[model samples]
Target: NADNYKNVINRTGAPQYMKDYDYDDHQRFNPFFDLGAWHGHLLPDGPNTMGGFPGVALLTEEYINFMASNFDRLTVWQDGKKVDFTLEAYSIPGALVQKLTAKDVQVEMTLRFATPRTSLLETKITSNKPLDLVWDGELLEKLEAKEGKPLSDKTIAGEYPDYQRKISATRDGLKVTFGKVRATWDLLTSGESEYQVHKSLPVQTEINGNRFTSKAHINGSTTLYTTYSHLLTAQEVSKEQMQIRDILARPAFYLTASQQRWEEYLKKGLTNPDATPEQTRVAVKAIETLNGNWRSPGGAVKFNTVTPSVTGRWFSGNQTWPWDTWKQAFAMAHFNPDIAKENIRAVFSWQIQPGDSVRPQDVGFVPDLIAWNLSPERGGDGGNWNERNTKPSLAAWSVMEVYNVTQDKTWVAEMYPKLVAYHDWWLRNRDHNGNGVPEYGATRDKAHNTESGEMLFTVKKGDKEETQSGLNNYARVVEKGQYDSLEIPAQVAASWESGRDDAAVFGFIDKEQLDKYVANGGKRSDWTVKFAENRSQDGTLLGYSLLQESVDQASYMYSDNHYLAEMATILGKPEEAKRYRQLAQQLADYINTCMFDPTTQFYYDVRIEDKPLANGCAGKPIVERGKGPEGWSPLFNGAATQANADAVVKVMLDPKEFNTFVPLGTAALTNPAFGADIYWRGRVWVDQFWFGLKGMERYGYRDDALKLADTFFRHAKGLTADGPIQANYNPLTGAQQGAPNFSWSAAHLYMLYNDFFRK
Candidate 1:
């Protein structure tokens, strides 16, 4: 979405507009850009930064107080003076080779990694007259001021006691170690010898982290070298120390290796679809977006799939989610297949078992994220685990997608049984009442949806629980003792499980008179009463207790199992394939029978428990005909039969209903709940859009799918504006909304182009 989708080079192996696509270079394809250890992804330097900020601003020591960095500019000495240079047209990902010109002097400054974890900024000041040079760089401690204030203006980031930086001098150079790691700063020259150290720079009362320079006045045509070394773990402190000398021995070799890593990445990279470079970097950006965010294990979160962002973890949870990993794997499979497969294996590795994640194919898996820490034998309290709302059964779908990439049956054989176990987990652990149809679990106990005034849909657990895993926001909202002014625990659980944090879907009424009536306590308030009161002008009938169990998970079973069945067929296991297909059919039938609405011919997230049969509140399984994205499950998964599909098509094509500016709306346009920027409610998620696009094709609406796909790609924030990929967009305005440079969105964008866009 960046103005021109910024590109240094598009997939066509051609440069786009004048360096705008430099954003592609920003990727470095080498997503995992390690400045030694875990020092990766320097925090973005805002939209406008000059002098070219270092990819490595901070010399990170996990034990030190966060990190510290070399700031401002490199001080140049010529007859003794300060020279400000301009950086221009730097090519090649290996190093930052910029020739800054000033008056009669040309400063050719090249920056590269001296060691895997060190940075070297070598400058050769060439002039007709040989000059004396003493270069000193400062350690910047960023001071945190106001929350939303500009960082540049916030006095940089200050230091707490945790950030303690130290410096020293060595025989060949200098060595400085923080808590558990050491850093070496070396000074060398091919022309002269007058090496010195100055540490009396007075430590400002408050500092963050790190180094130094000293010298005597002289001039003899010098080729000066400045190098800095860093370490993350104690395992190879000496090994790292040895490398510092190795780099100083031959810095060129290190630079070549650095450049070669990116080359190898380019060779075995995702040179995906990007002919119309105007908006194609989505694929490029997504791959790098993920690999760039990789971090070593820290705190409680472990594993290595990829993070939401280096700083963008869910609060302090800083972990990987099951469903989010599925998305990560799909996009990565195209470029980094082994890594993608490993992410799945990582999830499976942590399974309460019965989960489909085992892969016998030997592709090698890299589990980047294992956010969940659910416990059983001992108890889930051991790790940060959530049994309530993690993710539905989409592991098989993700594995199947990876399989589609390789189309290798041996791999399928490896992964097949694990998927069955995962399927079994859902049916065994999640399906509370043992009903054939699997339900989204919100509680460990069972539901007794018996309270009359309790209107929202919910099942029993030991007690009420709050949860929000990957979905972020579905259509769930909760108040204290009541939800939408109703005492429904089931609704509370439903709202908690919906993941839609605060979308204003729960309490709104149809008309002003209805709000007043509800305030006055009419036959009913909220909107449920409007149904009886005849005040609902638009047939708006959304509710919490109204859902008939959850919709998407049950429907997704149909989608994922279809892939599992296909895998079975590919494996020559006809019986297993038939069984999987039949299983999908049963799931589809259950959704149609239990969650589908015959009255409107549209599907709904129906109630979980039957109140009419017992001492419950709901008369029948309530169909909260809430306009939500779940309605498209049958279409997305290709689960709905023609009769069912025709009915869905009727409403899907109706602009008065969905017809989002692009993709499809989570809620219908007509619904009061509909509007862009309302998070999951009105926003268009590329993943969901991809699913819907698949549905359109599955349902024989090829033209319709293409039309929407065109609209999606063309009007997307990518094509309409200039920016990195976004988390989601406004449905009506197509404005870039949510997180900027989001991985999943860009991943889905590429998936669409590769799987659905122009051939």
Candidate 2:
């Protein structure tokens, strides 16, 4: 249903910006809206979104036909001209503060989101210069954009469609009225510019094409803005305007209120991680970034990690994935169980039942991710579901985390049956070979021609391929290969399941694949050889391999089952919990027996189903690969016996594997195959590092964990130098890299500091 269909930001400056998915579509444009880097789409709005990306305000030379897709953007134009102003972005509790300074004018603008669609901007300009303050929708550079383009003529009048938009007034100041768009926009200021103009049109956009003009260029010094959506009528719009008007007129009251709101969110259930104020500020910044992403959806949609920046998986990208949701919920559970519970419920709401149009499955299962334009009525499963195998099942573990923090057994019980059913759904379907020890492979339609260089479950023969870590690494990997490797047309699936993409890691490539890469040359980014002609396929397209034994997914049972065991035991379901413990132990036994090497004492991705590897020697079935998160899983989980844990810890501390300037590189620091494969490489994902910290505690080792944490603070550039919660940090220099202020990174930082360090 249109109602349930939801859409779902970042930065070098402060680690993130104010952004969300398309409210109407939420994922991609959905044939209607167009968006940015993580894809921020929007339109105007009366009730929901009319047609403009939210949290996007670009100040350009003149009103143009296109969209400027940048988060926390406020450009300055003099006499409808251009000037480069040094702008820096940072975040406080509820606001993203942007400092813009040019020779002509200097300004400080703090932007915030009070509601899902309402963004409040309080700008302080300290200049007598006459300049234009443009509130750019950041639409399209070229009006008619992509995604299966919107079906109707009046379907979104223009790129910044606003024939329906009007510059109205509140007794305090002026409020720009936006109706039927993604969000509304307004500024509380009076001094009219030399000219008040707009996109002169017969512009075509929205359900019925319309036009919208500029909210008159205002006075010099400072001003405030109020943006919202989903107004029932012109009356509701006026009411909203009045409310925002009152809030803006006495800016101090609301600004203080906003500060309190932020302070309250940060200091909720989690706080004071035993650090200096500056260090606490860093962690709180991360928490606030995640909290800032919350969406109070007016339609049928639910879920958010809310509005993640860089998980890079199916659900994470344009939509919500159970895997990321699980990771995020566990983190949020500590500070805000309400949002954490909402995060859990939101995704579960979309669970699919057997023969239910989407997958036609026999039982209920949440797909990899939900897309936009769902069913027309009650809302669900339109054609937009990712029917590939599910990501690692963790809702049970996630909700229990909520219970752990809140001691809310009622919530746990409420989530129990669904959790149990979710667990059962896996037993019912994912066990393809029915090996009792399940296989993590994709459908023939997804990835069967698994590539060697792309860091999937490597068999340690030819090129190095990764096969562990993030949950989706298995289903998404296993079958896909490098472009040259696949002769058939394949999919270039660049997802974030591995948590690291394009980073030099051994998970995707076997040792051989690295020496002689899939493109054959073996560079992390370079899959092609020096002179290889269009190597053959695209990215990690699959279809050949099935029941692939991705170490992370395979060994994942080490923790998933153990958590279930703990929960079941606590819930008094001794028998069920017993079964869970058995299941957990069984998998642990399987990993030690099959995947782990006593000599290496490290875990590798082993293929459970018999499949010939292209990178395999002599067209033979390979046996083992190098160590990855799987090697460490045994620590965090109770999978490893003391003996096993001893060996595992030894291997990780080895100068060659995980011990790096940044500690655990997603890719082994010592692996020759390690390179920047994006999310999967040498960078230290703080979340995984958090697990390692817990694992270190499990191994009765604290020094190493402390060392890792210390090195993390010392080296990570963005993190150390007052950086925001970065997506991940560069291993070598500890530079703040990737999408800034990533959710789980912040979540785990909190987990690590407050829960572990301080404790």
Candidate 3:
């Protein structure tokens, strides 16, 4: 196996140029690759104090900053004299390397993740004369907490607690065991060097601690191997020990394997013969961002998955989201289809099944988000799970994208039934009117019904409800009494289902429609929850739906049905394929007739009118509250008629709308609510950027897609530069916003380059 990589030369590909952007340890040090590990090591500045640290750091519920930042902190001594050295550090795709120079003595230190729980550090000494090294460092039990305000997003790491207090230096390593976490470091050296370890007291400590001191004598060229392994329990110790031994015995093979893996990935993603230097650099940066976020199976996480980000904040934990997976999988298909498949499996593993105990009526549904740790009610601990509302239906699109690249029909066959069930679940649960189109909705789960902050139902004595006629506090009293019936919490949950939390369209209720309902003697007690009695056929609750029909939801279902048709043809189920095509076309007809606004020349979500009095929307293309990137989704999926598609493209390119410094802000530029820092309001999310550009290219607007992409790359501040790929960007200024090293942003950027630039 090692022979495969014998000829592979290890070279640091493109250098990452991100400096310490924030001096306060608030932001994370730029990480290169941890290879599906829960921990990361870097040649950080000074002591492990800044956002960056010099040694190994493990992340469980929260990130533990370098258990022993200086486990291998060494000083070189030659001929009974201290040797002063100048050091240079480099972060490549798969490894971190530091070169130390002093007179004729040189030391090259390389750190690579050998396994999910093991980090291998190879220190090579090249000297004209003999040298002695002193390694002295404390294994700290306590450290400062993470620096940040609290966040409700469980994926972010907001607190840093103390680890195990006891530290022991074994014959060849150091060990710390506390609760279920075990931290160990095994040290060994090449035959040319002599090494000895001693249990000692702390050197310089902010907290009381023990130390692992080691002395090594090196002559000519000698290598040192140190494996930092973090395991969960004693059951894993034997396996981890064997892995460490094997890695230490043939360290070169492991290093070569990592390099070979990355090289293959780079060859696929960066081998565009026509790509410019800058274009290639963008792809490389994207790959690094993605690779840094990769996390292997740990705790409740059952499969290898890519998290949103692995730095500070909520992005530092082991969490995988559904919509994020859709975008990430699409790009992963080009380079690693197997991983793309696994990422899909990771989310689908939690899909609600036929005989489940909790939320059994919601069979075939996937939870909104799942992490390394889940609530004990469902299974694990630390509260990072959600079933309140699942994300939009993009799983089929993501599965087909992977299938397109791999041509692994067996995987398709495995996934096909699951997809069919998922599609069925949407209509069964989310479509309140049974019009072949669906609304974004919430689940009936208790979590979805709970509200944390002050409820809006609290009103003063003189306040009047919107529908109340000169009544004093009557509406507020009714609201407080009938809170569950009103399904107020479910409103936010329903918005979450759209994947655009707090989007203008989700909050909008047309006054004309309300007036019509009231005028027609429709006793609409509340406008938010149109029909709260909607439920599944089994009499089990299916949750509340938004009052309007979502154009994006309809577009996604249409795309799903269309792709289902494509997949059925491959599976040789012609009958099913025909059925799906009809289903897709039926939804397309709804969008063309009900959603498209001929006047605005752009599609908008149609306000669903309660039956009887509303003559079929004859006068105008239905009332909509806001314009957003969701309008272009139909064009992206081919649901819009060619004529309407042309209009949508025109609007997307208008100077006062989506066209911005970074084109395709989530909200239109002229939107009254648009703000540069607003999470879903005006910020440019990469997925929305992809949809907008992809819609253009899909509808014979490739040239515009190219120009938009060029402008995006040119103005997007950290995109082509050293800054990490961010969660979102400010469309007007192109300034990086939200979290850095975001997976979906990196994922779609790579997809964008291939779709638009590679040609």
Candidate 4:
């Protein structure tokens, strides 16, 4: 798909300026201004989104091809043709210029690049005729550049005084200045194109017909900008001003030094290639390109649109996620321990309180906040469909992993209280019944059904014997007529339903319903019949199980032996951490005893429920095959496999089960469980593959891990070769299954390289 798009762009010259100037040789005909980057030619959509440097307006394929063609031939053409042209340039700490050129003039341009501060470039030229000295074509902006004081004080008008700033000169260069550092840039001459250079401000350079000058400014306030010029039309500028104001009202995009460190760790993992160097390198690079724009603040990582026009947020596309951050942190801890710790901590910061557990359908950066509003109506008392809220425990597990890897006592101490608080919240609020065991509803989105006294076994009016049905716990009963008006007043309504019910059914009746039913002389008895029948069957069972797994995994990773022991003791089992490591051993034992099939060597998703047979025969309850071959059950149950469950585990773990010539699919598309038309029924998910691979590796299955890694690389390469990389793939044929150019999918590819193959 990507190749097809590339082909479309390449053959048809669809992205006009980008393909026009392919700088095959920088020494000859190095076009200073290529509009390719500006119009999404070289990059897909926007420059920054595809990992372009900040302030870099455009990048050209020719520029990249030239760099790839020869690394040493590239030179910075600092000396312009005229004698008066003398430019001073500096390479910011982490910044580098791959190549440069000049147009017959002695234009000396001094350049300095840094990550978080303003890059400084000074140009001096001796020209008899007014010279038009241009910078890289990809660097030009259409709007008038703004000028302000340099960020030497580490302060921006709207941002924190101590926040760091990143500045770069070359399109690909990135320079950062920490809050502790002070820097400045100045131009010798402030020509027509030369805007004021503040004591500590960022700058962009441009060339107008006969005048050459440098423009410097700071983003203290949001400003409108264009590729060709810095100044915008009134309408354009007004729109920009409005957009900036809107953005200012929201949280600013900021990253700490620690965040950068974490990103570096991620980058290292993705780029390292201990085996299959070329293949791994390509996979890692592609992955990096896909997830290049993801950002983490504090410790919580989320996807941002990468493009300058799009506000970076915690985005959940079609892929099942918000879990990606947890997985990303797990991978990061292997190489970058500090970042790994922070990433986990950020997740816990948003832990849902018992009363505030996340909704099943809610997908976003902060699941708890967005879940309640967007929760789906699954026809049963407003319940969510999956275990969305319970997954936070996984975040805790990632934290524990970081502690194990880095042995950072300070981080452990800092996170201990938060972890305990969240755990306590789950125990107290999640456990609807005082069974000492937590219970989750059918999905994360719905409210707990107190009326259905399954938690306490209370008997209701419609119950048989002493059994509890859907309504019993909550008491407020009155007989109703078929159609005549019962006229149950406000006092009765309040006494019958709790205040919570009011909020739950706030918008149940619309204007049309009210007018047709109530205003048309309809009796209150008619409304009661409609209301009673519409009540939801929201139940709790699977949510609790998922949450339990998350807590178990988190505790195991952190080496929190006591917590692991506590969980075991509560679940009616002995503490295993003492002898074999409480969390891992106990969980493994429980899974094997209850969910594993020793004969088949495959894990079952759930334990068979034993119930009294209606027949006179006394026999054990039979276990039924669950949903998909592996399904949700395999994700957690397989975690307990002593060592990749031999053949069955191998079947799934082996690239062959779902692995096509391309890569391993999420599930066996050709398996008996697959449905004809359904995609997930037979598709391979990148995220699932990561989980399976990670779980397998955790038990020290090096060969299995290597095989999985190889399969992933092959598939990724095939996909990239055939088209744009995708989020999911067909398990049987290795065809693209889901969205193309997905960030998390790309992140998974990076994990395969950096986490598995690299180190």
Candidate 5:
């Protein structure tokens, strides 16, 4: 009964081999590729990798003639025994040709996926009367009615003939010749067009000797003609074929029946086990499935599909990011080591040179050459603002992880040179102070004007003896309406290259220099600089802080780990690894302690140091605005204290917090941050879920890991069962979102299923 709801519709009147999927007697799904049917083959390219032709082709001149004449409808005879047909159509609003048609006949057709496209379509007709065939007025000129030799006789050097022309001759029936093909149509004797309901019209014929010419017949009896559309050329025909072929080949090319059977068997064991033996069997089955389906024989794991083209907001939306894919690989590694290794290598394929940078937001897809703001201006400082030359720290971290898991020395040796180049690029181009530490927001105040009415003052590293009082000049301009007061402070801050520019510039360097300055104690002032110019006012502070934390974490995780312990020793910080480990623990602890809400089981966006009291007393306020828990903050999975990590894992494992009846959502659906209409406000993003699940595993919460894996599998299966599966889903209801049949979502699902059921 459930399978019936998941039935796929065959919208195109092509051969069954070209259909999306085949069904068994019970309507259970099976792919054509798996059935030993030679319809099409999978391309060697990975998901989203470009360069391939579309797959399936069929011909129906009678159907086309029927649609053009009606230009709106086609009348079908239900009880008549002359012919049996089903009609399918769609409208391309601004399409060059507004109408098209195809008649389904049991014709022999061959499906192939070659770089060069080819096809053969044939049909036979037995006429009861002399029928006149007339081509539509709009397409009459496109028809080639001249006598010609067979298409096979023409050489490649010969001029290519267009397929639009038709050479029709009437005897017992009418026969039309397309390129490399011929189709015959039988005229229904009893059918006639009615004045009240214009049905099938009679074909008009003009005879000249043995050659008889006819006008294509038209029938206006239904409204479906308006919805029909067609495309010309063998290339288009091949593309359509490829699309159908891909749909059919997907399940077979990617999944094995053994793997599917194993998953089902494991699911039964896990969910319905009545004894320890059953549980064990289920676990083993899961592990087997994981081992089999998590990777290809060549070691590549499905990653993401590429967008068709770069345009609109999607221009920045297409590129791939190492950080996101790294987390994905780690999750996959738990299931299949080979797949994990390949995923790790894939990230290196996209590593940019040190001076070359990409936006942190646009990762995991191709990027556009358009300006950052989508403006006409070419190159500008703003375009690369989020991605200044920083160390390829994320890539290094992934490489080290891969090396540790696979212990493949050859892989390490090959990757080392690229890693070194990426690292060196960061040191040379990013280190403004040459102090070995990289900085972001290098050109923060390039447009600032000096008091001498000239733009002569530019911020540089090592500038000294500048006072806060010097900012008064810009403040005076603010007072005179030349510059805003808010703008003055930003300009002043930009003048100091070092972010730590305090009162030290005026004769204060060492501890003694600072003590004398503080003892005489001219007021100590705060001098934090706002470097990100593109952020919205509300997002600037939080975004910068998050970026800073990410950078710090990446540095600590990559350069201060056991894999890079030798580097730490050479740098004279033998304890650097230990220190970073402690720092990460501390930071994680701080986040949970400061942002967590015990009652709500969620995290707040920011912490409030002081709260307002009801009776003018000093106390924590009962109501906090923007201070309450919100999903806007990245969902970091952890406990407030080290001791509670286990308890937090339990919470995450609970179906109420991280899991939903349908699927796991990124944020708590009950949280106030969930906007009623906005899609992503409370949806489960695969990236976020991947991170959370990984963090659970990293902390050694095995039960939580299993729970998340199970939830993800169930949700993904549900989505796939729905109309068209997608890369992301509505966490609250498990409704699929974003592009349908998304490759990344499917890949991630494969990884997760392998982790819990197969591993």
Candidate 6:
């Protein structure tokens, strides 16, 4: 069953989607099971693009094309004659098998990841007659080629400025250093074999390893086992060699252990026994997707955290985001609770401390994104790190979700203080009116503090400069020094905090009042972008508050507060539990009274100012954005009353609104701004769909929830097919879009089905 499941998903080859997929702006392939390694290997699509051998595409660092293809080409000689063979490949969850069949012999190569940093490949040959075999391998770097003409070696090197290769023959096999990454291959044969250094390549052909060969003869059967290990630091080669030898000494034992691990994963993971084979395959596919995105602790990451997508260009680096971690951990808790716990710890590892020189006033805040490397401003080369804004507060809920599965009160006790500190930080820095409800805002970082009219910044790490490295000005309303636009950098960061980028509800800046501030030499009051002067006691500019209150943030915080109460009770702190319960109820009442609009029977974000507009709602409802799935958030997080949840679920099930061909698109289908290709504005993200379904089921609408789930399965393209799970889907046509082999989409699908459809 595991073999069949792996073959069904079979994350190999270069599919058509890999041709120009812009999710990561890179032409890279995907891997099935990487075993939480920063490096992974894929079978090459063709010889011209990868290499002229049955080798693998190697990945390291942030570059997917680290090595286009690597390793030895196989050839058999029978009494001084060249033999030809046909290839057929099959894959399992833990290993990949490729069989080469000739007239006289059959050769099979089995590959598996032995550890996070190493992979082992074993070759076995069966022959009816005596034969001699020779293997010659070459190392080729990735090249961006054109159709018109062939390219030279010098020309190819120019395309990749950092390309460098140094290969030398080792005692048993070969060692190579490609750019900053170094790799060593050790060959252990069951029979006698001779090794040689090929002299046809560059880099002083006299040196031993770059191009090499191993020759042997077989009468009945022979085996050749290869251990490959790559490291970012070159000095770790010797340490890796010892690990390689241990794996080579008992290759079968290692492979068997790997096989059993996946066997247990599949047995525990796929829970829907009564469902059709299609749905079961999707569950297995999600497991494969999640495991593929897993990365072990290395560099800046201190724990095994799962990233958004390993195949996505921007997300290819070993990085994790806060909101993504909460959702990922909730799903991971079902199959692997330890990883769930570790991921939550990973996000908290970088929490802002009061002792830090930069932004000490923003203590206890979690940065937006953390990776193997950080921004140049933070003294690192990676430009992906972001501290401009924090994500939605779901840490307590995620921690409690994991604790429920593990039943470990010790962990609950440990996280209790950290959770309380995080909640206090939100109220201190994020709440605009001290009304018990929190709003998303931008931190006092370099990007947010600048007086530049443009919302984006260009940062130079070395000689090259990256535009909008940490943040993008997607919904930027102001191009010049105009202070009254809703699309300024501060507002952009605040919107990013809501986790729904470029939504229509956030573009409600009051231009008339903003123009007055602009005329007065650019002085901002509460009506415009307000700084810490009004909210902070010290007036030290801790953060910048957006002009509007966000419904999703409030709903998430409501759940967070509720989870804190549960955790406190578990830790035997009755007073703390009572306080947290009261806090949660206060936010729930505020959400039910102020956020929910009676006329439209939907929930909308309100302005930040303390002015009652409609039905005792203490702010103007941003109804102009139209109906969005955010209204379902209050129901999902238990912040809505029974009557309010019923009304929300009714709009969620309506065909003209959220329930499209594929139900629960992030934005309503009837909205004028709905676009199939738009990122958050119109796409049917599976997580939001999951939220809608969960909310419907929460409020005694199980049939409606199941109906929407089935509708999603029947309509979403390739869900029951061979295609990889997509990052999001087109709402109208249900065609898959965005990144392929996406992590959160796959994670939520596992959660949605396991919680609802499992018998």
* Best model per lDDT: 6
lDDT of 4: 0.32
What is the C-alpha RMSD, rounded to one decimal, of candidate 1?
Answer: 11.2
Model 2, stretches more than 4 Å misplaced?
Answer: 1-91, 95-116, 119-261, 269-273, 298-300, 303-305, 310-318, 375-385, 443-484, 487-507, 510-545, 569-572, 609-624, 669-672, 722-724, 755-759
Q: Lowest-lDDT window of 10 residues in candidate 1?
A: 12-21
Per-residue CA lDDT of model 6 for 449-535, tens digit only, reads 554322343334435644451222422322233331333466678778888876656553234534544575644332333222224
lDDT of each: 0.49, 0.48, 0.67, 0.32, 0.30, 0.68
Q: How would you order the candidates by lDDT, starting with the best?
A: 6, 3, 1, 2, 4, 5
lDDT of 1 by residue, 389-506 (tens): 3455567778987898777677788878777766765554344345556544333212312222122333223456443211112233332224333233333343444444332333
Sort order, TM-score high to low: 6, 3, 1, 2, 4, 5
Expressed as tens digits, the lDDT of each residue in 1-759 for candidate 5 is: 111111221112211121121221010111111110111111111212111111111112111111111111112222233233322222110001111222422111121111111111111222333322222211111111112212143321132233333424333223223342222121111111100101122345454431333343323222110001122234333344443343333423222332343344344323333323322332332232222122111101123212111111121122223443444344444434454565455445444433334233222211111111211122432231222112224454555566665666676666655655554444343333232333332221223323322222222224332222233443343344321113233333321222112111111123343334346643222111222222333442111111111122222333423344433333455576465445445445444544344554434423111342243222221112111112212232332343344444555555555556433454344332332123344456554465456556656765766766666655543432323234456655566555432323433444444444322
Which ten residues in a row are the worst by lDDT in model 3? 185-194
Candidate 5: worst-modelled 10 consecutive residues by lDDT:
188-197
Off by over 4 Å in 6: 14-24, 44-58, 128-130, 145-156, 160-162, 180-210, 235-238, 451-487, 508-535, 610-617, 756-759
> What clash count goes with each model?
60, 129, 4, 90, 32, 6
TM-score of each: 0.69, 0.64, 0.84, 0.49, 0.41, 0.85
| Candidate 4's TM-score | 0.49
User: Candidate 6: deviation at residue 674, Å?
Assistant: 3.0
Between the candidate structures 1 and 2, which one is better when assessed by lDDT?
Answer: 1
Root-mean-square deviation per candidate: 11.2, 12.6, 7.9, 16.7, 18.5, 7.5
